[PDB]
């Protein structure tokens, strides 16, 4: 179980790392700094869609 | 004869008025064109995908 715990904490750091490395060119998709962002997908203004990545 | 000469000047004056009109219309086309450009890329920045540097 001690050896297994070392594998668990190894994968545990992996889950934390992927939450901080995935960026998409300087952003932070899964860090939680990605608040509600609206994408303007209409000819005029106002008809955007919010996307949230927890 | 006075009326005939006055009409000859009149078409000259009126044509001058037309030329001033199209000269303004020449810049009219461009200011509209660049304004359309202003609207296009503001919509490009109206979304949350791009970062602050963009």
UniProtKB/Swiss-Prot annotation, chain B:
Disulfide bonds: none annotated. It is found in: Secreted; Bacterial flagellum. Heteromer of multiple flagellin subunits including FlaA, FlaB, FlaC, FlaD and FlaE. V.cholerae is able to differentially regulate the flagellins within the flagellum maybe to produce flagella which are particularly suited for motility within a given environment. Belongs to the bacterial flagellin family. Flagellin is the subunit protein which polymerizes to form the filaments of bacterial flagella. FlaC is not essential for flagellar synthesis and motility. This is Flagellin C. It comes from Vibrio cholerae serotype O1 (strain ATCC 39315 / El Tor Inaba N16961). The gene is flaC. The chain holds residues 55 to 108 of 377 of the full protein.
